[PDB]
Ligand binder design. Structure first.
Ligand SMILES: NS(=O)(=O)c1ccc(C(=O)N[C@@H](c2ccccc2)c2cnnn2CC(=O)NCCCS)cc1
Ligand SMILES: [Zn+2]
Length: 257
């Protein structure tokens, strides 16, 4: 029932998921002047060289590229994290217009889109158990701006034709998520939540400072997707972002001086 319309969008979610008004909700606005460098942060390790992608799925919210997480293959370690976090999927949030689409904002600036690489803490054995823990997940967030094309994104753009409507999937093997990273791994980190229902407060957020650039044509292909299922009235999959939530008693830490 929840979605991103006037009748079922983020302002309505709290009626089915009261944690929507919780103490560690995401996303947030990152006030870069209030964020503090934290010398206790260890180097961030993004280790994706043995990633094994499997499939791409339109789940009615976004599209997810899913990975084989049955072994340590593609993992996130270091930074604010304790232990090893395994990549399970990535997806994006985007706008109807280039001036909006990201979930996190930076000094109130909205980006055209935001990539979420989702990882779970291997100490909990599987994703389902990890989402019952306050340090169960780590999401690596990457902003997208419109400018030059991102070559590493093109294979995603070109399969979207095949998963236009909710519940469609396609084989998506041998995709290398390293092609979606910016040059610098400088980040902000804070404790938060899933940004969609069930909005569970399990996430260590790691949001990169440097955006990647994608072309107008690339983001336009995202906006041709549908929220609805085949045969249903066409609802373009656009503006699938939750706005910034109250920071409450949290501190955002920076990895850079
Ligand atoms: N935006 S985010 O990175 O913060 C984020 C990351 C992961 C999930 C997620 O795994 N949600 C699934 C889940 C299954 C079991 C327990 C809890 C959560 C779920 C539940 N119903 N559908 N899904 C799939 C889901 O919503 N896919 C993520 C695409 C966001 S537009 C949601 C948001
Ligand atoms: Zn997300």
């Amino acid at each position: 029932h929840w979605g991103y319309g006037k009748h079922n969008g983020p302002e309505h979610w709290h009626k089915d998921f009261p944690i929507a008004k919780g103490e560690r909700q995401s996303p947030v606005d990152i006030d870069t002047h209030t964020a503090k460098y934290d010398p206790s942060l260890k180097p961030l390790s993004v280790s994706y060289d043995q990633a094994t992608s499997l499939r791409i799925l339109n789940n009615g919210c976004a599209f997810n590229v899913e990975f084989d997480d049955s072994q340590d293959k593609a993992v996130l370690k270091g930074g604010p994290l304790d232990g090893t976090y395994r990549l399970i999927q990535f997806h994006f949030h985007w706008g109807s217009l280039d001036g909006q689409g990201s979930e996190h904002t930076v000094d109130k600036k909205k980006y055209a889109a935001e990539l979420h690489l989702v990882h779970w803490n291997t100490k909990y054995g599987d994703f389902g158990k990890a989402v019952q823990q306050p340090d169960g997940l780590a999401v690596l967030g990457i902003f997208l701006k419109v400018g030059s094309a991102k070559p590493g994104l093109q294979k995603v753009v070109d399969v979207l034709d095949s998963i236009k409507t909710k519940g469609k999937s396609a084989d998506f093997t041998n995709f290398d998520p390293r092609g979606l990273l910016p040059e610098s791994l400088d980040y902000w980190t804070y404790p938060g939540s899933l940004t969609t229902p069930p909005l569970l407060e399990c996430v260590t957020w790691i949001v990169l400072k440097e955006p990647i650039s994608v072309s107008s044509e690339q983001v336009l292909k995202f906006r041709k997707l549908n929220f609805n299922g085949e045969g249903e009235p066409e609802e373009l999959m656009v503006d699938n972002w939750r706005p910034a939530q109250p920071l409450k008693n949290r501190q955002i830490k920076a990895s850079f001086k």
